[PDB]
Structures are given as structure tokens and as C-alpha cells.
Design a protein around this ligand. Structure first.
Ligand SMILES: Nc1ccn([C@@H]2O[C@H](COP(=O)(O)O)[C@@H](O)[C@H]2O)c(=O)n1
Ligand SMILES: Nc1ccn([C@@H]2O[C@H](COP(=O)(O)O)[C@@H](O)[C@H]2O)c(=O)n1
Ligand SMILES: Nc1ccn([C@@H]2O[C@H](COP(=O)(O)O)[C@@H](O)[C@H]2O)c(=O)n1
Ligand SMILES: Nc1ccn([C@@H]2O[C@H](COP(=O)(O)O)[C@@H](O)[C@H]2O)c(=O)n1
Ligand SMILES: Nc1ccn([C@@H]2O[C@H](COP(=O)(O)O)[C@@H](O)[C@H]2O)c(=O)n1
Ligand SMILES: Nc1ccn([C@@H]2O[C@H](COP(=O)(O)O)[C@@H](O)[C@H]2O)c(=O)n1
Ligand SMILES: Nc1ccn([C@@H]2O[C@H](COP(=O)(O)O)[C@@H](O)[C@H]2O)c(=O)n1
Ligand SMILES: Nc1ccn([C@@H]2O[C@H](COP(=O)(O)O)[C@@H](O)[C@H]2O)c(=O)n1
Ligand SMILES: CC(C)=CCC/C(C)=C/COP(=O)(O)OP(=O)(O)O
Ligand SMILES: [Mg+2]
Ligand SMILES: [Mg+2]
Ligand SMILES: [Mg+2]
Ligand SMILES: [Mg+2]
Lengths: 369, 369, 369, 369
């Protein structure tokens, strides 16, 4: 009979993590989770394809071809929830972090479908093996891999109570089910540690570059320091409300989120109830960039235009640039701040307020390092 | 004596066409027609170089080295018109779609200049050949290629009345002229079908990325639905005139045309006579992007800033993004819509109107697929 | 004992120079001077690293790891000044233009440290050698290279009066010091002539692209020609002050400087004393782009939005584009000028002034040519 | 203080084995054991280099740079015997089957020399791990690698009685010694299974081809079947002694052994005591080729000249060729048998005996497959 596919792509491991989540590393044009799913999907006409996710909203923006379901607290819980979507006799289950699974291994699992309740790849070990620094008999060791094929009904039953299983074979085996072991492959290794990247022949990120714009206006008339990019410009010529009033930081935040497709500052820091009154805007900026780095992006450069009749920003431009660099952990040369008056024209010219235009270019994080 | 060059680059075949015209596929930094012309031009100090074109204005922006002439209804008509520019004894004529013509083939044609009235490459065929599904004697078949060298005066005379000839050899032969056949080459194949691309070793497009900006202002005070990116925001708080009043769609159209070097919305859809009063702005947007795709470009991403005191766009941002994606046949994650008020300042703050800032990044279409 | 490093990177030779300074050619992500310094620095735990520079402000934006010092009028003067920073027994000195110095050559110099006062690589010559077109005995010729290691105290003394020495070995030798010659290498060649590039296996520039924005406002009400991008739009509807009043050229200048991290127009052409009253703004634009080319950047494209109620720019857009292209020595297709009114809203709508928004994309100059 | 090196290269595992022993696979020009030893030897000026071996005579023919010692029944026994050759404070020990150990890993072990009694690389495991098909906690697993550095005196003591240890860390630890674990590397993997080859980036065998000659003479005058290449030529015109009298098979055996540097038939099958009287010569041939395959060689072709006045071999040549092919598991086209008389001249011409000249070309076994 027929087979469905569950791709396990939820949870957030710190084991690997730089600031970037491993599921959003770019392989060619595709985020890793999509690359892995596309790969396995190409092997077989699955009845249904399910992806477990901790970021459904974001992932849905990348395809219309799969069913997404919110992950659970463990692999086995994400799996159990996704199984309720499956009604085919068989289900293939795979870690997304096993990216380069070959058609060959797939065929080897498929050709053995009727031999057992669960079919899984495995590798032997020829190294001395220590458990808790004490020697084990290495010949009796199996390292288990994925994809794994199971009878759907049995795997469902297998996960009725125990959600601790790290794979499907131990789950099925613990209820008396039979396992068929198939030889595994180095291409089915699981990306877990930062050091695993160079052990795999992964496609490097595409060269696409994303543009962001930011525009913001604050009003003059608050008796407090004027802070722009966290730098004091004037002791008393402050702007009203919006935390510490840093229109620059706010405009720049919008550009960075915009280039990454992550909305705007009001969606990230909803300030309608005056919740952010005491916020440091440069910290808000830093946290917004953290969000952008999590999904696999990196800044190339920043260019800014401050529109203000007064005060003159000339003596502060290098310091603003340097503070932005430090906040975002960027080299200083990548930041530029400009200014113009409006020749005493309009609301800006009347000194009623000031505006800031920001432009940003983002590329994909180069995990090649 | 001396030789001129006519590059035949007019007409618009649907035989190949995706949305992109084959003459504007990027090979390195150069559009295909320019790459092919540069290639042949490098072989010989031609007295004159003529290019027939259906897009003279656009092509002229790429070089000052050639004479351009408007094409005709057929190859032979474009050729006939271009010949009126030639006064040298000999003329080399070539399809631009034959991109990788070697110096070797050129020399082989040149060394045989005095043997006949027209010198042309040709290939034999060893496959079974059917004409209308009936077998022909394959040994008697010649597949003709280009470049072809002819005595100018004879080719002019050859095209006096009959404009149906698909090459120069049949034209010259039909008036009793003699043809010299030279062995052809796989590198002189004509790009005709989408499938031909992988049969040629063409240079892949450069990684250059083009920026576009768009800014537009519409006035409040029309009692109709507020439509932004084709999405209804408010039932009555509409903007005046400009079709359905979609300032967003209009700003975005400007950014896309701007990045492609194609002017602005008023040049593409002149609306001075109220001609577009009933237009769907999102359809106008789609058609503008079609123009950009025709000349070899593709969108990477879109970022937008709506400047409006009211209404609040928060609940509509995902829908606007999704409608832009659907209209432009782009993945949703590549679109971002932001908003800000101006703190009740200026014409925007007074609710007299609203403005939209758009940014776009365009790359060259990757015909590699 | 211990060793410091002096990288010699000051002065501006026209011997090589296109418009680009050789120290700012991009090798991967790094400017050449930084690439060379990083390379040598990786060979040894130097006590101190000094770089002589004619652009300290700019270079400091790229790293915090080195000490920078202003160069002198000659190599030997830059060296002498940098030596006052060194207190270790030994100093390695190297031309930055010798980019690909191998770890191998380094070891060969280090292993011979105690043999003499100065250790230097050298190559023999097997070609016929002419001095002033008269033959010399080629077997007696040495071509000297860098890095060179010297006893710090001796090299200091060596440069007490004579600042004409082109290397450290002749300096040390002229005071009776001993030189140890070590075999050199083709990888230690000095980039001097444009033709040297293809003789070295240098890493090609990265594909990063930098965004720039420009926004400027001028006021109406001066009875003079309206010049935009150096093109006369109107005989009398001029803008006030700012040289010839070309807001477009001024906005575009800001975008180009901004993308390159070079400040804004007021920092480059301070006009507070009415110094630029008679300037041609398009010449100012050209000179600003020259600055950007000096540090290794090149324009991909320009997109512009003119915000003006009047006059209509339609009939002038192609001419503006063409004049910008000619001024910047760019192909015409890379320039686009758009326009919009503000529906009679705000200061622009009242015809009190006009504004110009510019966007630019810059890439690294491709010295591969 | 100082360090010696022990390369462990004895024993004959069938785990990997085709007919070829893994220590004699060719990597470039070098057998694997020599390639691995050369690699590690290049990292450090070891006081002494010891190689344990089951083929000392053969290995000694490849270098004069190492001390060879006969292996024992286990890794630990070979190690224990080799240690009696070491008097330096430290000893590095390594499996030869870990071929591509990097200089990097070496440095990491060396920099930690004083931290413990034994320094070893190790890798963590992120796969589900079964011991006897039951799940273990994968986080507590270490896979141990080589090289391993130990204090010589302690490792000697560690191996006083127990010769079962599969590595040096468990040996040292079992006597209360301390272990320092250093991160391992995929390049230090141990070639164990045929499938491991494609997991390593090993240098492919050189293209050297080895010539062999064989010449043999048997005497006529025995009343028995004439067998040549195991094929009956004549029912009664037999040759005297030498097993079944097959001079052809005997000559060919000499050529194959000769090309491989393995002596001659009398050294392999000493027949002075009439021990081989009942042998099948084609089986002896097959076994001689097995020896040649064990050391990494493979036949390209065989050419033979039989010198015999009678009988005529014409009708038997294809059958002889085919029987040689079957015996040696070679494609038939690679075998050729020729014949000539001597015009009734000499001992052959008098029909006193017959001679066989053989030529063979051997290449290195292409383990790439
Ligand atoms: N709560 C979780 C945890 C992990 N997973 C997925 O299960 C796979 C295996 O993860 P571990 O190696 O962390 O067990 C990963 O692909 C991970 O994304 C999940 O879907 N839900
Ligand atoms: N017309 C508008 C204006 C603002 N907004 C939202 O409200 C937030 C706060 O707006 P101000 O910056 O104008 O205070 C913005 O970041 C944006 O999320 C909106 O959705 N629609
Ligand atoms: N009206 C036309 C049609 C084709 N051509 C050119 O003639 C060449 C041959 O086109 P066909 O293969 O479509 O005949 C092409 O390079 C095409 O661009 C032209 O210059 N004018
Ligand atoms: N100053 C101006 C303003 C508008 N225009 C043109 O007029 C068109 C319509 O302008 P509005 O969008 O302001 O209605 C623009 O798209 C542009 O082509 C111009 O050429 N010069
Ligand atoms: N005044 C100068 C001149 C050259 N130099 C440096 O000295 C090195 C050798 O330059 P010449 O080949 O021009 O002598 C170059 O790396 C150059 O940058 C310097 O530091 N100060
Ligand atoms: N608020 C401001 C406005 C202008 N400036 C500087 O003054 C210069 C001239 O300003 P105008 O273009 O507004 O005349 C700008 O190029 C910028 O260098 C500034 O430093 N701070
Ligand atoms: N009796 C033995 C067995 C193995 N060895 C060597 O020890 C190393 C490890 O072998 P095992 O993986 O078989 O334990 C191999 O390099 C092998 O050649 C040895 O020197 N003497
Ligand atoms: N014992 C022999 C001798 C010769 N021959 C064949 O007879 C041919 C002629 O032999 P002479 O060169 O010895 O005349 C050889 O080329 C070979 O084909 C044979 O088959 N068996
Ligand atoms: C990209 C930019 C900056 C576009 C211009 C939008 C803007 C800030 C208009 C201000 O109106 P106003 O100052 O003319 O209002 P007022 O009627 O008070 O003069
Ligand atoms: Mg200004
Ligand atoms: Mg705001
Ligand atoms: Mg408009
Ligand atoms: Mg003969």
C-alpha cells in the first residue's frame, strides 16, 4: 500500500546554535528544512507530507506543498502529533538535519518494506567505544540513522505513553515490534554540531541580497537629551515619547526587519500601552537584528539620512556610526550616517519634528566560515 | 576588398519564449544580442556593424559602437532594410541567436571568400530524416548555419521581391548565384527552443543586483473603499483618482520599473486623459513586472513603508504581502509591508493624504533553471 | 628574543593606479592591505603590528588589531616613523603590495635569524640584463624581496640621516651591517604595475553589494535656469543657492558617498561660507564618485525619484539619464530618473520647494578585467 | 622531553579483505602503510619510528628509515613488543589504517602533552546508539581515535599482563592513569570495511605498470598426457616430472611472481623432495596470483610463446587461453598463446624438450571500483 512522509523540523537546539537556527541555514536558495524536505519528497509520490515546526507562520511563506504542524516538547511528541495527520499504511519519518539522504539509501529501505515493522539504516563502529569513560564491546554497537519507515498504526501505538524515544526503532521495538536494519551512509549524518558542517558536502548559500527601507518621524518638544543611535546630540532638545526618542534607531530597526521580511518595529515591540517607555532603543535594535540572524541573514551595510533643521549632526556622525557598529557587532566601515535640512520647509523645516530614512542590504549568513 | 557585419536581432519569437525575450538573457554582464555581436566583431575589422532590432531605444543604451535599424516582418525584410546601410563589397550576416560562433569557423568562411557568391557553414545528418512523417534520403540533407558571407550587391538583388527566404544561401541561389559550403559546428547552433540552452556552453548571468525606489502620494477625501495592494483596508476612507487609488501598488510599480531602468508609471500608463480610471492597479503592477521580466530581470525582494496617520494597517499587512506575492508570482517571504504615522505632523499627519515608500532588489533571470 | 611586524602601506603610486588605489582592491572580503597584513600576522605571534598609512581614519574602520601611523614622503621615512613604535630586538618589515608571501619563506627567514644583522629573500636572474640599455653581468644581479628581518636598533641607526633606501638590506649594509640572503619566491612579488595582477594568484573580490540612499530638498524662488542632473528644465523657475541649485545631483552625490561609507556632500564640500557658489554640481558629483572608485567600489545602477509639483520632467528624463551616464562614465541603461507630484499637498505641493530621493547599488571593482 | 612513534601495521583482518590486504593498497606510489607512516613522520622529528609488521621482509624493501618488528596476536601484543624499542619519555602510537591524520589534530594532541598520562582524540555521537539492539544514552558515548600519546613507562606497565586493550587510553586508565580527550576528526577515521574507502579522500593509485618474464624448460620422454595450461594436447607425449609437467603454467607463474617482485616458482613451491608430484599446476598458478593480489597488484595481460617442434598447438590455443582466464578470473581477451618450432634446430628441434616464454604486465589494483 501507500506511504506518507513526516519531516521532523521543530524544537530549538543550542547544541549547534550560533545565533542562526540550523533549519534556516541557506543551501542554494532554500532554507535547510526546505532543502531536506524537497530532497526526500523527490524520491517517492508520498500521499501526504507533514513538517513539524516551531515557526509555522514563517515556514508557510516558503511553500504551499506540505502540511505544517506545531512541534511538541520532544522529538517523539512532535512525531505523535504529526502522526494524527497520517492514514496511510506506512510512514517515512526523517530528521530535517539529515540533509543529503541519497536515493540509494531510500531504495534500500523501500525494497525491505515487508521484512519487519520498522525499517532503519544503521552503521557499525570500528573505534574503541567508551560509555562514561569505560570500554564497551564495539562490535555490538549500532549507530542508528533516519529515514525510518514504520507501519503507521504500530508507531501510533508505540507513542501512546512514552515520549522519550529518540528514534522510531526503539519505540516500535519496546512494544515487541520487529526491526529490519539496512546499511546506512555518511550522507545521512545528522547536522548537530557546528563542526558537522565541514563533514557534509552541503550546497553553499546563494548570493541573493535583500533590500530594506526604514522611515520614521518623531516630534520635537520634550525637555530631555536628544539621543540618536544612542549618542547624545543635545542636552535638552529632545523628541517626544517612543522610549528614549531615538528616531534613528527606530528607523534602522524597521529597515533591518523589512529586509528580512519580519514586519516592523510596532509588530515586534507593540508600544500602544506605553510598555517600552523605559527601553534602550539600541538594545531594541540589537534584539531585532538577533531575530534576523536567527533566520539566516547577515548585514552587508547601512546607510542613513537624517532629516533635521537642527541641531547640526556633523560632529556626532562618526560616534553614531561607531555605536551602531558596536551594538550590531559590525565593522565600522559598513555604517554611514548622513544629514540634511529641508531649507526651513515643511514640518521638518519648522522644527516641529525630525525624520530618518534608512537603507540596509542583507545577504545570507555564510556558514562556510 | 572589405566586409561589413549585419547582426539579425529583431522580431519576437514565442517558440522559445518564457516571459523573457532570448535577446535579453544575460551572458556574463551582457545581454545575449550584445554578447553575440561582440563575439563576431572581435574576429575582423568590419567597415560597419549593423544590428536589426525591435527595441532600438533600449539597445542603444548598451553601446555606441553599432548602427541600429528597425526590423521588418521577416528575417529577410530586416536583412533587406539593414543592407541599405552597407556599401562594402562583402557582407557577413548572422543570427544573434547563434551565440558561440568560433574564430575557427570564421576563418574557414573567410579563406573561401572568392570561391562563390555566398559562403555558408553546413552540417550533414546521419539520423533517419522524416518530412511530414515520411522518410527522406538523409545523405542529401544539409542543415545550414550562419554566419554567411555574400557579395553585397547580389544579396540586395536577391531580396528585391521575395522576402520569405530563411537564409542568404537560398536567396542568392534562387537568382542563379553560386554557393560554397563550409563544414559547420555545434557552437554555431541557433538558440530556438528552451531546451537548446543546455545544449550550449553559454556563460551564466553575472551576480549584479539592481536597486529600485518608488515614492507616491495620493490625497484623502474620496468616499470609496481604501484599497492598498488590492486589499480593502477601509470601506469609505478612500483616496482620490489614480484608478482605484492604490498608492501602494503605484509606488511599488515605480520601484520595479526603476530598478529595471524602464522609467516610471506615468511613462508606462499615461493617465492625463483619465484613461485608466477603471484600471485594477494590481493588474497594472503585474503588467509592469512582465515588462521587467521580458528584458531579463527577476525580483529578489520587496520592502515597503506606508506613511499614514490612519487607518491602522496592522491587521492587513499579511494579506497585502500575500496579494502582492500572488500578483507577481513570488514566494510570500520575499514581500514586506511596514507602516508609520508622522506623529500628526505635516500633510500626512493632518490626514490630507498618504505616502508609500518602496524598495526592490532585482537580479538577472537565471535561465540555468 | 621577540619580533614585531611593520607593514608598509602608505604613499600613493601612480605607477599602478587606475582610479583605484592598490591597497583597496578587494581580495575576498578584505581590502588588499588588510589581506596582506592578516597573512603575515598569521605566521607568528608578533609583539606589535604596525601599519603605515595615508588613510588612517578609513583603515581604522576595518580592524582594532594593529597600530596605525601616518606615512612619510618615502618608504624609508614611513619605516623610520613606525620604528619609533618598536622596542623588540627584531622587526619584520614588509611591503603590503607583496600579498601572497608564503609560510615557507617566512620559516626560511626565521631559521636564519642569528646569521646576520638583516635577513632578506633574493632571486637570481638568468635573462640578459641591461642597465640604461647597456649589458650587465647577469650572474652578479640580485632582485631583493620582502619580508626582511632586521635587528631593530641597527635599522633605527641605519635610517638616522639617509631616507632614500628602497629596502632594509641596503640601509643596514651601508652602515657596515651584515646581510644573509635567503632564496625568494614568485609568491612574494610586489604588485606594482597593472600587468602584475595576472602574474599573481590573488583571491577575486567578494560579491557583496552596498546600498546607498540620498535625500535632498532645495527651495524654489530664484530667477535662474532650473538645472537637474546638469540639464536645463526651465529657463527661470530656479532653486535657491547650493551652487547651481541641482538638487538631483546633490541627492545622488549623497547616495554614492553613503553606499561607500564616505559621509555626505556637506562633509566633502563644506559650503557654509558660500565657497561652492560657482561650482558645477555634476563636476562635484563626478569627483565624489572618483573618491568612491579610489577605495575599490564601482556603481551597478542608479534610481531616482524627483518629487515636484512643477515643472513636468517627462521630456527631460532621457537627457538627465544620459548626462549622469556621461559624467560618471557609466552605460546609460544603468540610470533611471522618475518623478511624482504630491497632489498639491505639503510644501512640495505648494511649490515652495522640491525634493529628490536617490538609490544606488555599489559592488567591488572587479580588477580581473 | 622527546617522543618516538609506533605505527601499528601488523595482523591480517578479513573484515576488510577482498584478496588485497589493506596495508598494500596503493595511495599514489606508496603502499598504504608507508603513506600513513610518511604522513605522521612529517609532523615531528621523532627519536625513533617503529612499524609492527606481519611482512617484514617485504616492507623492508620499501624504506630504510624505520625500525620494523614482528607483530603479535593482538594490537596490544604488537604494541608491547614495539615498546621495548622505545626509551624516550613519550610515545605516539597510531593505527596505519588511520591514513589521513591532519597536522592540525597532531598539534592539538601535542599542545596538551602535560595535561595527563595519555592524550587521545575522541568524537561525540548524536545518533541513537544501540548496544545489543537496546538503547544507550548517546550523550555518554565517546568514539576514540588515534594517534594517542602516552608516557612510555606507564604504557609499558599498562601492558604487563592484559593484552586485550583495543586502544592505549583504556590500557592507561585501567591502571589509574589520567586521560586527556581532544576533539577528533573525520580524517582520522580507521579504514576497516570495504565501504570506508569512499568515506575517505584517499589518493588514487599511480599508473605504474610492472613487467614480468618467465622462461621454463621441461624434458620430453614421459608416457603420460601432455598438459599445457591445464589442457590436454596429446595423450602420451608427456614431459618429465615437475608435477603434471605443465611447462606453460610454470613459466607463466614465474612471470606473474617476477612482475610482483615475489621471487620464482622454486622459492614459492620448493620441489626438491618431490613434494609437489601430485599438484595441479594451474592451481599452483592460481595461488601464486593470489599472493600477487594480496600485495596490491592486478594483471593487465598475458602473452606466451611456446617453443616446440611437436605437437602442433594450433587447435588448442583458444582453449589454453580460456582455461588461463578461468583459473585467474580474467577476461579472455587479455590472454594470448603463441607457438613456434626451431626448424629442427637445437635440443627443442631434436624433440628432447620444450620451452615456454611468458610476458605479463601488472598494474596496481584500482580499489576505486
Ligand atoms: N521537540 C522537537 C525536537 C526535535 N525535533 C526534530 O527531531 C529531529 C531530531 O532531533 P534530536 O537530534 O535533537 O533528537 C530534528 O530534526 C529536530 O528538528 C522536533 O521535531 N521536535
Ligand atoms: N497607519 C499605520 C501606522 C502605524 N502602524 C503600526 O503602528 C506602529 C507605531 O506607529 P508610530 O511609529 O507611528 O507610532 C508601527 O510600527 C506600525 O506597526 C500601522 O499599522 N498603520
Ligand atoms: N523579423 C525578424 C525575424 C527574425 N530576425 C532575426 O533573424 C534570425 C533568425 O530567426 P528565425 O530563426 O526566426 O528565422 C534571428 O536572429 C532573429 O532575431 C529579424 O532580425 N527580424
Ligand atoms: N514633476 C513631475 C511630476 C510628474 N511627472 C510624471 O507624471 C506622472 C503622474 O504624476 P502624479 O503621480 O504626480 O500624478 C508621473 O508618473 C511622472 O511620469 C513628471 O514627469 N514630472
Ligand atoms: N611614502 C611611502 C612610500 C611607500 N610606502 C610603502 O612601501 C612599499 C614599497 O613601495 P615602493 O615599491 O614604491 O618603494 C609599499 O608597500 C608602499 O605602500 C610607504 O609606506 N610610504
Ligand atoms: N541636521 C543637520 C543638517 C545638515 N547637516 C550637514 O550640513 C550639510 C548641508 O546641509 P543642507 O543640505 O541642509 O544645506 C549636509 O550635507 C550635512 O553635512 C548636519 O550635519 N546636520
Ligand atoms: N596483531 C595485530 C593486530 C592489529 N594491529 C594493528 O592495530 C591497528 C588496529 O587494528 P584493529 O582495528 O583490528 O584493532 C591496525 O593498524 C592493525 O594493523 C597490529 O599491529 N597487530
Ligand atoms: N608446436 C607448434 C609450432 C608451431 N605452431 C604454429 O605453426 C606456425 C609456423 O611455425 P614455424 O614458425 O615453426 O614454422 C606458427 O606460427 C604457429 O601458428 C603451432 O601451433 N604449434
Ligand atoms: C521620503 C520623504 C521624506 C517624503 C516626504 C514626505 C514628508 C515628510 C512630507 C511632509 O509634509 P510637509 O512637511 O510638507 O507638511 P506641512 O504642510 O506641515 O509643510
Ligand atoms: Mg541638503
Ligand atoms: Mg513611527
Ligand atoms: Mg504620483
Ligand atoms: Mg617460427
Amino acid at each position: 500500500s501507500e506511504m506518507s512522509l513526516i519531516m521532523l523540523a521543530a524544537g530549538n537546539s543550542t547544541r549547534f546554535n550560533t545565533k542562526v537556527k540550523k533549519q534556516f541555514l541557506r543551501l542554494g536558495n532554500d532554507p535547510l528544512w526546505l532543502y531536506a524536505t524537497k530532497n526526500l519528497s523527490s524520491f517517492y509520490p508520498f500521499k501526504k507530507i507533514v513538517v513539524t515546526s516551531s515557526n509555522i507562520t514563517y515556514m508557510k511563506k516558503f511553500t504551499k506543498n506540505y502540511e505544517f504542524i506545531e512541534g511538541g516538547d520532544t522529538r517523539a511528541e512532535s512525531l505523535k502529533k504529526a502522526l494524527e495527520l497520517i492514514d496511510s499504511e506506512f510512514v517515512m519519518v526523517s530528521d530535517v538535519a539529515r540533509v543529503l539522504v541519497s536515493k540509494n539509501l531510500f531504495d534500500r529501505l523501500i525494497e525491505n518494506l515487508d521484512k519487519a515493522d520498522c525499517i532503519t539504516p544503521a552503521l557499525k563502529v570500528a573505534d574503541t567505544t567508551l560509555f562514561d569513560n569505560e570500554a564497551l564491546q564495539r562490535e555490538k554497537i549500532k549507530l542508528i540513522q533516519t529515514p525510518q519507515i514504520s507501519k503507521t498504526k504500530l508507531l501510533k501505538k508505540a507513542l501512546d505513553q512514552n515520549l522519550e524515544f529518540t528514534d522510531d526503532s526503539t519505540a516500535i521495538a519496546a512494544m515487541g515490534g520487529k526491526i529490519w536494519f539496512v546499511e546506512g551512509e555518511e550522507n545521512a549524518r545528522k547536522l548537530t554540531f557546528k563542526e558537522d558542517l565541514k563533514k557534509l558536502d552541503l550546497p553553499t548559500p546563494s548570493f541573493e541580497i535583500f533590500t530594506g527601507n526604514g522611515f520614521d518621524v518623531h516630534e520635537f518638544g520634550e525637555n530631555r537629551p536628544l539621543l540618536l543611535a544612542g549618542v547624545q546630540i543635545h542636552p535638552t532638545m529632545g523628541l517626544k515619547a517612543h522610549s528614549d526618542g531615538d528616531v534613528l534607531a527606530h528607523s534602522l530597526t524597521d529597515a533591518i526587519l523589512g529586509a528580512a521580511g519580519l514586519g516592523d518595529i510596532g509588530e515586534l515591540y507593540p508600544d500602544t500601552d506605553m510598555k517600552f517607555k523605559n527601553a534602550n532603543s539600541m538594545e531594541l535594535l540589537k534584539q531585532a537584528y538577533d531575530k534576523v540572524r536567527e533566520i539566516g541573514f547577515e548585514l552587508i551595510n547601512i546607510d542613513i539620512c537624517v532629516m533635521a533643521q537642527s541641531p547640526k549632526l556633523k560632529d556626532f556622525k562618526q560616534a553614531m556610526q561607531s555605536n551602531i557598529a558596536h551594538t550590531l557587532d559590525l565593522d565600522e566601515f559598513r555604517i554611514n550616517v548622513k544629514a540634511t535640512t529641508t531649507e526651513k520647509l515643511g514640518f521638518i523645516g519648522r522644527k516641529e519634528g525630525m525624520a530618518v530614512l534608512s537603507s540596509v542590504n542583507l545577504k545570507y549568513f555564510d556558514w562556510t566560515r
